[PDB]
Design a protein around this ligand. Structure first.
Ligand code: CL
Lengths: 852, 854
């Protein structure tokens, strides 16, 4: 059938708020069983004082889960915690939960108690109906399917202690047979009602010392514990991270026993173990370690270990390692299987078997312990290699056993782009949630698989995760940037700049990105017939290279096209487009009116037709007065050419009168600065003589002009004329008319809506200040390249980071070569890095809420 | 070959106002509303609750000792579990399967359950609560306790998906059987209403109808009525089934996922996709459906969501209306067990050929176009079942949906056959005499239903320690009624006694010739003697009273009949623990022991007679004499001797005709019983036989070429005990048989070794030895005759003997005597589960409404 892997995990265990703390406690030999009065007075009714308790049951990020406060207070704490642990298990696997919505993903939850339901229905006069929706057993599974939008089976099951490993088994069968592509498996247990512990006490199942002395002579019962664990299983193809592959999972039941229903049968357990390795085609000698059910009972331990010995140790030359998580944290009953699984996977990820606590003298009823066929892990031991088995046996006789093949994927071989900086983006319910992801990303900045997975889980809408951040890794000038995301819809606008943005060496830093390089090489092919190569112009060390009009027009357009291609590969589509002068050629590419070759040829012919003609000497100057003021003050022959902002306009005309006016104006104290245009009066009647030959060349280039969309605001045609036949398409005529007409830039900027995110598409963000002045103050202005910057690749990635802060989604993973999956063993855990808004404290039943 | 074919093989249940499925059906087809308004569980109207709810008649009954539960544990067991254990046993036997045959198998158990109210009531007092209440009330035990008792080793799981739980259990068990993981499975659904607080929760959620009625599909639908239910179904792969109610063509589940309307808003679009995906994957056409059992809880929002989803899934291209019904309208909504309750209603409708109608349907919900246009037709009147697939929906309030497709079993009744006129034996076992009486009475009422009787006979082999009462009835016979008795405790060794001379009678065996196995045995014996101008079957048909006066005829015919009787006993698996033969009866003993083949035994009887005849000895005689053996010896005139030691005070003498006759006459004069035997005028077991020895030995050496050892089960009557370990007594050789003819019959001597409490069968065409056996055996022995001289119908007499064998605690299935019934049983074969009775005299604890917080 289908290969089944464990793709992600999370959990809350005794004295452990997450799996990292669980591991620290395990490998540190910390006893997680405690003796405080968290749940009820110590020794109440003669109960043992010790039990494994979660640090907190009151926390729940209710609004992220769409739960109203009234329902949150009346929801079983097991469910409140399982909703968050489930989310963490999914992202732990590097999967964005949104990608599983509407799928036939299944949910199986192992659960045996409904104490909250009892507490909440105790008063008929005051009880509320919605406590049934938050506490009824089926909801422990159904509420997950509801929130995550999972449509596969949704089942809560009870086989007592083996519940959660039985959920794992049923989930494995559903994936193996092709019924589900993925599944959530959960295990939950809380200790709210002291009466329940009294019942177990009187059955003789509880140790008076509240300890699971697994495999030890002194074993006399188990210590009750709490636990909330979730695991994400998927078919191999869907996994990003793989902790292990499930080779087989199976169940049987003891059936009739002369000793009674609660007497465990080692003979039946042994048959289960054997039938599973036989049917998986696995040899008993291939096992390195077995996680025994190991509750530390006088009858159960020998039954189980002697069954393991007969099933697995008959022909083994080496001892078989054996451990029990229950010796470290107590017995979380139905959640026991998944807690033991978490200890196993964490041991494998760290290369060390965590050891048992409380093992001093071998149970004398167990020969393999005295003879070395079984070896208890009572010291941390390196993981050497081999399959792992896990047992979970219920007190009613339901047995489950699973065989795992650990993922041993080695770290990747050093690669070229690994040296390039990378962008890491993060989202979170709070600033601390974001900070936590960026900090760990920084700490593992060379772990490409880890960063790739983090980048994949960050695309969560700002309405759900209001804080965002980024960090450019492997660069020079970087540190984490975090901010709350301004609420509302934020339209994305592209501004393509015109002349004055070229500089020696421009684009060379971005050439290290394959997509940008490939775009440039494609532009080279367009101009090859004209003896030009864009990549060679960019490599030129001659400061005068871009003084040549054709070099600068072609190189500018090529770079703009390369930047638009980087943005497109991340799925960005602008809501608005504005070009300045020659920038309209790249706007036509961005709007989808011009192909890459047409845009590049259009910039070539525009410059070449200028080169092939003679024009009288012209000049342009930035004047410190309004458009209206300019039209009245301009001397004869001089005209307003660019309406950049309210108080800054560019004039164009005959060289002398221009230099004169600049003089006159400076006389009257007005700002006047001659621009350098190489003796050209662009955007004036002066260009008129270029029109005819340019129109002839462009008609051959743009054979089938396409209509400009409403996103694209023309700067060469006044708004009053937007319905004209000339403004309809990006035709040879449209492009010729741009050259001889004024740039109505400020006019277009006025139509940019509030809260827009504006990117400057240019080799140097020349228009930043003009943009700030002409745009509504609620706009975010982002530059993508800077003249002479040490490393424009880093500057560009910071801008993509700023895009993320603004609430726009752009995954930087797409800019770099795809990481190979599954991730290497040891890729850092993600679930413990997830933080929620846990400021509120929700109702939790008290010991007195139950009958006494 | 997608996988294994899955069938519903048996069912049982306890539903509102219905102690079993027969009462459930009577209520359904009779239009009886099973929802009531009494104070059984709590003061009606308490907390403003609706007064009406579906309640089981009793929650206190449980045959604790059958299930090995001590009284202290029975009082602290959830009533759901106590009831489920019995309903599970009834579901298995309902299928005509003896539960013992599933012990140790990988049979699975899935139980749909949503409440543990008893567990709450029983753990309320920390000072007094006991630990074993956890073993009888924890949710996992609802499944685990069944696996434990029945010895099932497949998966054992309790599951909760709210309303759809029990149909989800059925889907999971269908998948485990279909994929080859389990050969069979028990599927259960349970719900009880003990805690009024629970109903308050639902009331406040707006889910309960103030009228306590599920007005399914009706404009007045405003919520559901809560009910109780305990249902169990046995699923098996096709090959294991005897009865088949229906084949499951497909079963599947999906979940609503996220809904803008909230978690409890039912999604018709998702339900519709489940229905479509299932008939598409089963290769079933939507037009092939006759009827659909809708979840139909009678809610304002749910009904149209469901029925409009059904319309889009199934009614797009249908030319005929699709029938729809809802069992909830009849008995309310038993929550997790609703899927199995609906299933019971469907299967009972199919078995009776009538769709049981809904109650409370007056005006169609106006938001459902197909009810207004006739594309969907509510069954509000009983309608005949016409043919086609059936679908069943069960949707949980949390969004878990289950749908199943069934193909009804339409197997017609069997074609009239010749053997169907023969009488049949019905055996029964039970916890009480009333349980046995109930099976025999129903068997009598359906005496021509072969499949029904065959299935009843298959469930009767239960040890006496578990079912202390047994009974039988010979059906289709002239006379005879039920025999019921408590089964005497202890091991009871089975002994075969093969009689000798004096048992022959004109027409013997003719009645048994109607049984194919007996007839076939006789025809085989005919072949052995055909070369000698004899045909056993023709001697049995002879109307000549002198036929058996010829010793060859009588020897051969007796042996053949005893062999035929041994063959009938062997086909039922009976193996004797002891064997004693009388005179020529020792030949059949050899066959029964295993040392003589049928042909050897028949040829041995032939030669014994023919060699005697061939010698033309002087006239001899034998006579049954009412004297002890010793008392006989001293009154035995010269030439006359004691030949057969039958009992303490009765012996057979043998000698010269003249002196035996004269001695017989003087005996009658002196008031003694003197009865001359029919011996072809010969003196058997006497010196007069000595001249026959040599030629007989020569013929027998050719017949018995390779003697075989005589088991220790076989006590010799021709060789004194002191010599039982000699070489002659070792094998059934030519010498052993020659010696039998020439030596006395030490019958009484052998009888002394028969142990106490033995069950003794007389293998003979006429049970001549009954009184001798009574006298010579310990008084604790049961003596059973198999044939009687001149009986009107020895087939009936033989079956009544097989019945007596059952009563004694020995197992012998009479089904093996008759042609095998073809399985699956015909549709309509009477239900068995309702016929099962238990020892329900005690009343066990049930929590009271006041045992919960108020
Ligand atoms: Cl035999």
């Amino acid at each position: 059938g289908e290969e089944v892997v464990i793709a992600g995990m999370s959990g809350k265990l005794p004295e452990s708020e997450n799996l990292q703390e669980f591991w620290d406690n395990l490998i540190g030999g910390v006893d997680m069983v405690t003796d405080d009065d968290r749940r009820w007075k110590a020794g109440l009714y003669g109960l043992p004082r010790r039990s494994g308790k979660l640090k907190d049951l009151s926390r729940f990020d209710a609004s992220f889960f769409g739960v109203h406060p009234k329902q949150a207070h009346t929801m079983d704490p097991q469910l409140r915690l399982l909703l968050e642990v489930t989310y963490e298990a999914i992202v732990d696997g590097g999967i964005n939960p949104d990608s599983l919505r509407g799928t036939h993903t299944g949910v199986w939850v192992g659960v045996s108690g409904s104490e909250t339901s009892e507490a909440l229905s105790r008063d008929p006069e005051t009880l509320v109906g919605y406590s049934m929706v938050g506490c009824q057993r089926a909801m422990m599974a159904n509420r997950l399917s509801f929130f995550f939008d999972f449509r596969g089976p949704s089942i809560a099951l009870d086989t007592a202690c083996s519940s959660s490993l039985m959920a794992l088994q049923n989930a494995y069968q559903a994936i193996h047979s092709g019924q589900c592509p993925a599944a959530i498996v959960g295990g939950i247990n809380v200790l709210l009602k002291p009466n329940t512990s009294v019942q177990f006490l009187r059955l003789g199942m509880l140790s008076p010392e509240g300890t699971c002395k697994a495999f030890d002579t002194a074993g006399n019962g188990y210590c009750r514990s709490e636990g909330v664990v979730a695991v994400l299983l998927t078919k191999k193809s869907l996994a990003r991270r793989v902790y292990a592959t499930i080779l087989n999972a199976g169940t049987n039941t003891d059936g009739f026993k002369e000793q009674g229903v609660t007497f465990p049968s080692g003979d039946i357990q042994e048959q289960l173990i054997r039938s599973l390795y036989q049917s998986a085609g696995v040899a008993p000698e291939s096992f390195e370690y077995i996680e025994a059910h190991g509750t530390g009972t006088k009858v159960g331990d020998p039954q189980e270990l002697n069954g393991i010995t007969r099933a697995l140790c008959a022909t083994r030359q080496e001892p078989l390692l054996i451990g029990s998580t229950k010796s470290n944290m107590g017995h979380p009953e139905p959640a026991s299987g998944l807690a033991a699984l978490a200890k196993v996977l964490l041991s494998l990820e760290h290369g060390l078997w965590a050891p048992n606590l409380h093992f001093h003298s071998p149970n004398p009823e167990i020969p393999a312990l005295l003879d070395g066929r079984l070896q208890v892990v009572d010291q941390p031991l390196p993981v050497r290699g081999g399959n792992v088995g896990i047992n979970s046996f219920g007190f009613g006789g339901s047995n489950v056993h699973i065989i795992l093949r650990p993922n041993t994927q080695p770290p990747p071989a050093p690669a070229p782009h690994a040296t390039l900086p990378r962008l890491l983006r993060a989202s979170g319910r709070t600033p601390e949630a974001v900070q936590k992801l960026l900090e760990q990303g920084l700490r593992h900045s060379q772990d490409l698989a880890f960063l790739s997975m983090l980048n994949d889980i960050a695309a969560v809408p700002a309405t759900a995760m209001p804080f965002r951040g980024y960090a450019v890794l492997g660069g020079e000038r970087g540190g984490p940037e975090v901010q709350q995301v301004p609420a509302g819809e934020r339209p994305l606008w592209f501004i393509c700049s015109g002349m004055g943005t070229q500089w020696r060496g421009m684009g060379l830093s971005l050439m290290r990105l394959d997509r940008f390089r490939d775009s440039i090489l494609r532009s080279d092919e367009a101009v090859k017939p004209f003896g030009l190569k864009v990549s060679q112009l960019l490599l030129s060390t001659d400061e005068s290279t871009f003084d040549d009009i054709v070099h600068s027009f072609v190189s500018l357009t090529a770079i703009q096209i390369g930047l638009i291609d980087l943005l497109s590969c991340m799925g960005l589509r602008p809501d608005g487009i504005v070009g300045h002068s020659l920038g309209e050629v790249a706007c036509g590419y961005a709007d989808g009116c011009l192909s890459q070759e047409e845009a590049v040829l259009a910039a070539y012919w525009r410059g070449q037709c200028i080169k092939e003609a003679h024009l009288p000497p012209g000049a342009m100057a930035a004047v410190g007065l309004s458009w209206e003021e300019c039209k009245q003050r301009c001397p004869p022959g001089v005209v307003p050419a660019c309406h950049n902002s309210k108080d800054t306009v560019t004039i164009s005309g005959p060289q002398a009168p221009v230099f004169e006016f600049v003089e006159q104006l400076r006389k009257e104290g007005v700002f006047a600065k001659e621009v350098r245009t190489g003796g050209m009066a662009f955007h004036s009647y002066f260009m008129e003589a270029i029109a005819p030959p340019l129109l002839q060349e462009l008609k051959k280039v743009i054979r089938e002009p396409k209509p400009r969309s409403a996103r694209w605001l023309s700067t060469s045609i006044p708004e009053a004329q937007w319905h004209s036949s000339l403004a309809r398409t990006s035709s040879a005529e449209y492009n010729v008319n741009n050259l001889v007409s004024p740039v109505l830039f400020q006019e277009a900027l006025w139509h940019v809506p509030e809260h827009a995110v504006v990117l400057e598409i240019a080799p140097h963000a020349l228009l930043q200040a003009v943009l700030k002045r002409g745009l509504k103050p609620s706009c975010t202005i982002i530059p993508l390249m800077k003249k002479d910057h040490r490393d424009n690749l880093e500057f560009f990635l910071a801008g993509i980071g700023r895009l993320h802060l603004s609430g726009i989604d752009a995954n930087p993973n797409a800019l770099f070569p795809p990481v190979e999956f599954p991730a290497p063993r040891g890729t850092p855990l993600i679930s413990p890095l997830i933080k929620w808004d846990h400021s509120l404290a929700w109702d939790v039943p008290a010991a007195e809420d139950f009958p006494n």
